[PDB]
A and B are shown apart, each in its own frame.
Chain A
Amino acid sequence: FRDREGQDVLLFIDNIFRFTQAGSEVSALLGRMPSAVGYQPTLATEMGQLQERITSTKKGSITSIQAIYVPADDYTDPAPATTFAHLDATTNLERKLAEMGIYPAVDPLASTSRILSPAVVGEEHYRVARGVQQVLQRYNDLQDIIAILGMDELSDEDKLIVARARKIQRFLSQPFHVAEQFTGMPGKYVPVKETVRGFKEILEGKHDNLPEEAFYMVGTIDEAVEKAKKL
Chain B
Amino acid sequence: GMREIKRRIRSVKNTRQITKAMKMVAAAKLRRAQETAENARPYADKISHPMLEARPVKKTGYMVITSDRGLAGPYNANILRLVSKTIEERHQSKDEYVIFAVGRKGRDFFKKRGYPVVEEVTGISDTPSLTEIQDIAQSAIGMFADETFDKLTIFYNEFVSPIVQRPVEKQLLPLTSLLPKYAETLIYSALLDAKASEFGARMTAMGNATDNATEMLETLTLQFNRA
Residue interface bits B60-99, CB-to-A below 8 A is 1, else 0 = 0000000000110110010000000000000000000000
Closest to B212 in A: A148
B111 to chain A, nearest CB (A): 13
A138 to chain B, nearest CB (A): 11
Q: Is the CB of A110 within 8 A of B4?
A: yes
Q: A231 at interface (Cβ–Cβ under 8 A)?
A: no
Q: Is the CB of A144 within 8 A of B3?
A: no
Q: In the complex, what distance in Å separates the CA atom of A107 from the CA atom of B222?
A: 18
Q: B49 at interface (Cβ–Cβ under 8 A)?
A: no
Q: A52 at interface (Cβ–Cβ under 8 A)?
A: no
Closest to B15 in A: A148
Binding stretch for chain A, among B6-14, B40-48, B116-124, B148-156: B6-14
Q: In the complex, what distance in Å separates the CA atom of A73 from the CA atom of B227?
A: 8
Residue interface bits A135-159, CB-to-B below 8 A is 1, else 0 = 0010011011101111011000000
Q: Assuming A141-B8, A148-B216, is B77 touching A94 (CB within 8 A)?
A: no
Q: Is the CB of B227 within 8 A of A148?
A: no
Q: In the complex, what distance in Å separates the CA atom of A140 from the CA atom of B8?
A: 7
Closest to B3 in A: A110
Q: In the complex, what distance in Å separates the CA atom of A75 from the CA atom of B227?
A: 11
**Which chain A residues border B2 with CB–CB below 8 Å?**
75, 110
Q: A190 at interface (Cβ–Cβ under 8 A)?
A: no
Q: B209 at interface (Cβ–Cβ under 8 A)?
A: yes
Residue interface bits A73-93, CB-to-B below 8 A is 1, else 0 = 101000000000000000010
Q: B204 at interface (Cβ–Cβ under 8 A)?
A: no
Q: Is the CB of A152 within 8 A of B209?
A: no
Within 8 A of B (CB), among A90-137: 92, 94, 107, 109-110, 137
Closest to B206 in A: A149
Q: In the complex, what distance in Å separates the CA atom of A94 from the CA atom of B227?
A: 10
Q: Assuming A148-B209, A149-B209, A149-B212, is B11 touching A141 (CB within 8 A)?
A: yes
Interface CB pairs A-B, < 8 A, 20: A92-B1, A94-B1, A107-B1, A109-B4, A110-B3, A110-B4, A141-B8, A141-B11, A144-B11, A144-B12, A144-B220, A147-B12, A148-B19, A148-B209, A148-B212, A149-B19, A152-B73, A153-B70, A153-B73, A153-B77
Please give 10 more A-B residue pairs, beta carbons under 8 A apart, in addition to A110-B4, A148-B216, A152-B73. Answer: A140-B8, A141-B11, A144-B11, A144-B12, A144-B15, A148-B16, A148-B19, A149-B205, A150-B73, A153-B73
